[PDB]
Write an enzyme that holds these catalytic residues in place. Structure first.
Site, PDB file in Angstrom:
ATOM      1  N   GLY A 198       2.774  -2.933  -4.831  1.00  0.00           N
ATOM      2  CA  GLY A 198       1.506  -2.546  -4.239  1.00  0.00           C
ATOM      3  C   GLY A 198       0.444  -3.590  -4.361  1.00  0.00           C
ATOM      4  CG  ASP A 199      -2.529  -6.171  -6.458  1.00  0.00           C
ATOM      5  OD1 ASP A 199      -2.860  -6.869  -5.463  1.00  0.00           O
ATOM      6  OD2 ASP A 199      -3.267  -6.023  -7.457  1.00  0.00           O
ATOM      7  CB  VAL A 200       3.442  -8.412  -3.623  1.00  0.00           C
ATOM      8  CG1 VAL A 200       4.201  -9.789  -3.578  1.00  0.00           C
ATOM      9  CG2 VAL A 200       4.374  -7.398  -4.311  1.00  0.00           C
ATOM     10  CG  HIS A 204      -0.704 -10.097  -8.904  1.00  0.00           C
ATOM     11  ND1 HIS A 204      -1.309  -9.142  -8.111  1.00  0.00           N
ATOM     12  CD2 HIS A 204      -1.680 -10.585  -9.710  1.00  0.00           C
ATOM     13  CE1 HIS A 204      -2.595  -9.069  -8.404  1.00  0.00           C
ATOM     14  NE2 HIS A 204      -2.847  -9.912  -9.382  1.00  0.00           N
TER      15      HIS A 204
END
Ligand SMILES: [Ca+2]
Ligand SMILES: [Ca+2]
Ligand SMILES: [Ca+2]
Length: 301
Positions: A198-200, A204
């Protein structure tokens, strides 16, 4: 100074014993301040010192997600919060380094990913990682507090977010028309959902020296929904070529594939103004309100 010992003391009440001389500080956002250190066995640790109460209920979901991924995934690392208290959250630092530039430092030594020279192993290993992650049993997520969508719920969710942003700012006619064409096209929408990160982004993704992805960090957005969200980074940073390379590796290792997969991700990328507008509403910051209206193609001045 007085801070350093304070860290050393908080660690002791959670059975963590550090080398006082290795400590480095890092970002102290709205929620916590981060600390790097070694334990007396030479292992590197990440400590989060909370600077706001409610730290438990705010992190409950992310802790459930991290525990689930740690239990099931064995081809990449994710933070394992093995100290999880109101006073301290702490985990062993992941292997490797974040991909891309290493900001907020003196010197200019480590630079952003060179899109002219991306190692094939990067797309191949990220496909391995996302395919394993997206295969983790959603039934196990459903027993937790994670958001869990069916495919029809993921489609309805997008529809609803689009309507809410339109009600606050309006949306340009051609852009609205493109979003609605996408929403109404049955062939575009995946018939499966899975646990996403959800936050690639580059920062990260943990990589080794051969640009093999060894781990992912920052799991606050994890949920069971359309897996397409985790391919956006590749499309935006590497273009259609990098997106196609990631889809191919994912499809080859056994991830869920459907014939309009690539076109769907590109339409989802074209809905990025929804997310800008959502941030402008949540933050109230004037700059992002401006950015949201230009991105929504509301006629301006
Ligand atoms: Ca593991
Ligand atoms: Ca549930
Ligand atoms: Ca102008």
């Amino acid at each position: 100074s007085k801070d350093i010992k304070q860290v050393i003391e908080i660690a002791k009440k959670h059975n963590l014993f550090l080398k006082e001389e290795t400590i480095q500080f890092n970002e102290s956002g709205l929620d916590f301040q981060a600390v790097f250190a070694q334990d007396n066995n030479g292992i590197d640790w990440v400590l989060r010192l909370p600077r706001r109460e409610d730290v438990m209920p705010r992190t409950k979901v992310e802790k459930q997600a991290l525990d689930l991924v740690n239990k099931y995934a064995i081809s990449f690392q994710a933070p394992n919060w093995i100290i999880y208290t109101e006073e301290l959250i702490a985990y062993k630092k992941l292997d490797g380094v974040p991909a891309g530039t290493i900001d907020h430092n003196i010197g200019n030594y480590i630079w952003e990913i060179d899109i002219n020279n991306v190692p094939e192993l990067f797309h191949k290993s990220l496909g391995r990682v996302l395919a394993e992650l997206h295969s983790i049993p959603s039934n196990k997520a459903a027993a937790l507090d994670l958001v869990v969508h069916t495919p029809e719920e993921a489609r309805m969710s997008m529809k609803q977010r689009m309507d809410a942003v339109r009600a606050k700012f309006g949306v340009g006619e051609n852009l609205w028309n493109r979003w609605q064409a996408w929403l109404n096209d049955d062939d575009m929408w995946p018939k499966k959902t899975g646990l996403i990160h959800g936050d690639v982004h580059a920062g990260h993704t943990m990589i080794d020296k051969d640009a093999n992805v060894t781990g992912l960090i920052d799991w606050t957005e994890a949920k069971v929904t359309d897996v397409s969200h985790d391919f956006i980074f590749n499309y935006r940073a590497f273009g259609e070529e990098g997106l196609e390379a990631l889809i191919l590796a994912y499809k080859e290792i056994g991830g869920y594939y459907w014939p309009k997969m690539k076109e769907h991700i590109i339409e989802l990328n074209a809905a990025y103004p929804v997310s800008i507008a959502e941030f402008a509403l949540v933050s109230g910051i004037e700059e992002y309100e401006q950015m949201a209206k230009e991105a929504l193609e509301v006629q301006g001045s």
